[PDB]
């Protein structure tokens, strides 16, 4: 397993087969797989050094770990992009020994530099990922080179975790399972050699090929992405508010000790005692319960303020903050969620230093139909489409049809303030009753950002009490079309900053 | 095995089998099976018996639904055989449906 | 506080303290079957570098353990490794049991 | 093997419980009996 932690260095050596035994399409599969792997690894913003060595009858080095540019994602991506399949026409044999000896030469050159006795070299871990069919027909047995690799790093029983050799064969090409198993490192409780069919399965397997368990710093957005993980692992920021043994409103962790939730959950309660926030826990499946010490309600929120004018309910300024009385120990089951208009969101998007949230708004909501997700009652993740631009104008018009609740004309300027986002149109799901406050997030560069929280809607698909899982479907003839809404976080920056200026670092 | 008191002939009813696991921190891996009965055409036909492998979470229970439509009268036996993996437990429950 | 543990069907393996390299030895894992049902299992040792097994390494031996009884299986092995090895013996039963 | 066991400790005040779990086949391996520290040894120590 490729260990992830804040201490040390991770030298990644990606070897790609470039022989006659792999065709051009298989080489494209290998290249896109390596691109995906190098993209995912850099998402954790750790110290990583990546070296690309496409190998054939002779070993050709495309980028050097010793080179100081190995700590840049775009440079490595561009260097891998310039790989050529025809560069090895003179020699089309598979020479695994050449690649392994090139890796050994790189490692020895690094060892001579900076001094072997220095702890900086001692704390370096290695990970060699070979994408090949394994049929190495010349140059010598891989065992000699592997033993040489072990001896240079003196990989004993105690230091067995400092060298990981993988052998992943992805594509239609025939793969000898025995050879791939022999090439991969032999460890007691994990698999190091795989055979696959496409790149999505490789993404899943690579998601299993890491362990963020040793990482416990306050990083936002980072979360699992494999489909075989628990529902809480995929959305660690999901926390829940329990008034009295009931499971009413959801939330999102925005810091070590803060939670952001809708303000209409705390309608008729000022006794913060007996209120418990359920937070995911690595051990128990029901989570650990925390106590809230300060609940802040937006002063501009008043449901019945426009009652006389004809607006039965107006959900403006529907936002609240919670401060747990105890610090949440970050783990693999609970991590914050990236909020925009802050330094960490800028860092997670790999944007220039001199950025402003005016650019963040366009970067994160450029499309006229931006995909987004929110968490269901049972913990699953659903899909919606936030609509901006001219497409937003048609959205609010549908509310005017619902004159049974507000008899007035109810145009966009009156009921649907600019603070709300569309959803629920065409092939889009709608939240049930009991999902208010749940983050409406979106994924960018393998990192999750929050761009709003559920506020209200026009149809509850959980009215039928079949189960907590079954969800009704709105009939096509259902007179009010489903048209949900979510408070937009960007418009609420003036309220956010003065309440969280010290906790975070806003732009 | 949860059954209705009595199901009228030619009525489609979803009987269920609830498996309870009482281990504190262990997860059972049971292989439930529905035996074929001539009186009602279960999902298990005479050619192939119906078997499902279900994993029960610790300190929890899992419900396996079955659909049986009776085309005969009287009292007939509904049997489900469950065998646990690595725990030797082969408990199976048989009941009578009117 | 006495606290006993049990399996009701397990493999018991007792290696010697140490063995000279290149000197043939015999492993005698024993299957214990304390269940009430007569059984039948297949026992094989996972091949590993440094061990010169018999037959190549991947072969398995069929052995049946009656109810409330034990049975040993002999595996001749000449360890040709240098320092140490980690040998694993796996017994797998039928789908009926 | 691998089960989770709930172990309860109870005293009359704050105390430093010194725990230890030991195999029993060690006694069979040992040629001669080697009794552990029990209340008899403590009582002999006090009255010595």
């Amino acid at each position: 397993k490729i260990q992830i932690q804040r201490s040390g260095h991770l030298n990644l050596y990606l070897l790609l087969d470039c022989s006659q035994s792999v065709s051009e399409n298989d080489f494209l599969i290998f290249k896109e797989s390596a691109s995906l792997m190098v993209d995912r690894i850099f998402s954790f913003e750790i110290n990583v050094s990546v070296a690309i060595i496409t190998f054939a009858s002779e070993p050709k080095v495309l980028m050097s770990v010793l080179n100081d540019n190995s700590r840049d994602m775009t440079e490595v991506i561009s260097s891998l992009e310039n790989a050529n399949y025809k560069d090895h026409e003179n020699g089309t044999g598979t020479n695994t020994y050449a690649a392994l000896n090139s890796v050994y030469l790189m490692m020895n050159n690094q060892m001579r530099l900076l001094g072997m006795e220095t702890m900086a070299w001692q704390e370096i871990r290695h990970a060699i990922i070979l994408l090949t069919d394994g049929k190495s027909n010349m140059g010598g047995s891989p065992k000699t080179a592997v033993d040489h690799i072990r001896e240079i790093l003196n990989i004993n029983q105690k230091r067995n975790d400092y060298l990981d050799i993988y052998a992943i064969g992805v594509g239609k090409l025939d793969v000898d399972w025995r050879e791939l198993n022999e090439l991969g490192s032999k460890k007691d409780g994990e698999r190091h050699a795989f055979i696959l069919q496409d790149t999505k399965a490789l993404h899943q397997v690579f998601e299993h090929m890491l362990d963020v368990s040793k990482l416990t710093d306050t990083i936002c957005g980072v979360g699992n992405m494999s489909a075989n993980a628990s529902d809480q692992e995929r959305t660690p920021w999901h926390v829940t508010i329990k008034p009295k043994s009931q499971e009413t409103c959801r939330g999102a962790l925005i810091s070590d000790q803060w939670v952001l939730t809708a303000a209409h959950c705390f309608r008729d309660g000022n006794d913060h005692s007996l209120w418990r926030v359920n937070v995911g826990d690595p051990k128990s499946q029901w989570g650990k319960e925390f106590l809230i010490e300060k609940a802040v309600i937006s002063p501009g929120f008043d449901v019945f303020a426009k009652k006389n004018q004809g607006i039965l309910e107006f959900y403006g300024d529907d936002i609240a903050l919670l401060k747990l009385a105890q610090k949440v120990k970050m783990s693999t089951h609970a991590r914050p969620i990236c909020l925009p208009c802050t330094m960490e969101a800028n860092l997670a998007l790999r944007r220039p230093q001199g950025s402003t949230c005016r650019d963040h708004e366009n970067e994160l909501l450029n499309k006229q139909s931006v995909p987004a997700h929110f968490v269901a009652l049972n913990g699953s993740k659903l899909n919606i489409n936030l609509k901006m631009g001219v497409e937003w104008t048609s959205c609010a018009e549908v509310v005017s049809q619902e004159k049974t609740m507000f008899p007035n004309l109810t145009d966009v300027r009156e009921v649907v303030t600019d603070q709300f986002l569309c959803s629920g149109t065409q092939e889009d799901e709608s939240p049930c009753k009991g999902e208010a406050g749940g983050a409406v997030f979106l994924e960018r560069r393998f990192r999750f950002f929050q761009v709003g929280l559920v506020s209200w809607g026009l149809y509850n698909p959980c009215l039928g009490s079949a189960d907590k899982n079954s969800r009704k479907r709105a009939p096509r003839s259902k007179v009010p079309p489903p048209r949900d809404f979510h408070i937009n976080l960007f418009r609420m920056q003036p309220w956010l900053r003065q309440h969280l200026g010290d906790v975070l670092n806003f732009l | 095995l949860r059954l209705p008191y009595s199901v009228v002939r030619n009525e489609q009813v979803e009987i269920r089998a609830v498996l309870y696991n009482y281990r504190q921190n262990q997860e059972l891996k049971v292989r439930v099976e529905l035996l074929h009965n001539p009186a009602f055409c279960s999902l298990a036909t005479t050619k192939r018996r119906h078997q499902q492998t279900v994993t029960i979470p610790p300190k929890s229970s899992l419900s396996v639904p079955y659909v049986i439509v009776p085309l005969k009268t009287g009292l007939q036996e509904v049997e489900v055989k469950a065998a646990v993996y690595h725990h030797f437990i082969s408990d199976g429950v048989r009941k009578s449906l009117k | 506080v006495q606290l006993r543990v049990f399996r009701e069907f397990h493999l018991h393996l007792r290696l010697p303290m140490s063995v000279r390299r290149f000197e043939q030895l015999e492993l005698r894992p024993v299957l214990y079957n304390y269940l009430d049902k007569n059984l039948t299992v297949s026992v094989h040792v996972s091949p590993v570098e440094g061990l010169c097994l018999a037959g190549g390494g991947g072969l398995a031996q069929q052995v049946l353990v009656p109810a409330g009884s034990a049975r040993p299986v002999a595996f001749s092995v000449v360890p040709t490794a240098a320092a140490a090895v980690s040998l694993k013996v796996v017994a797998r039963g039928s789908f009926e049991f | 093997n691998g089960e989770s066991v709930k172990l309860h400790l109870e005293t009359d005040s704050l105390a430093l419980v010194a725990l230890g779990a030991l195999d029993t086949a060690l006694y069979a391996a040992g040629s001669k009996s080697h009794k552990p520290l029990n209340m008899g040894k403590v009582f002999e120590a006090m009255n010595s």
């Binding site: 007691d188 | - | 039963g93 039928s94 789908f95 | 691998g2």
Partner: peptide
């Protein structure tokens, strides 16, 4: 082969825990 042989109808061998 004096008696029968039940080959490849046995357990997966991956679900059997390893005691070490």
């Amino acid at each position: 082969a004096l008696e029968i042989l039940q080959e490849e109808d046995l357990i997966d061998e991956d679900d059997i825990p390893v005691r070490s």
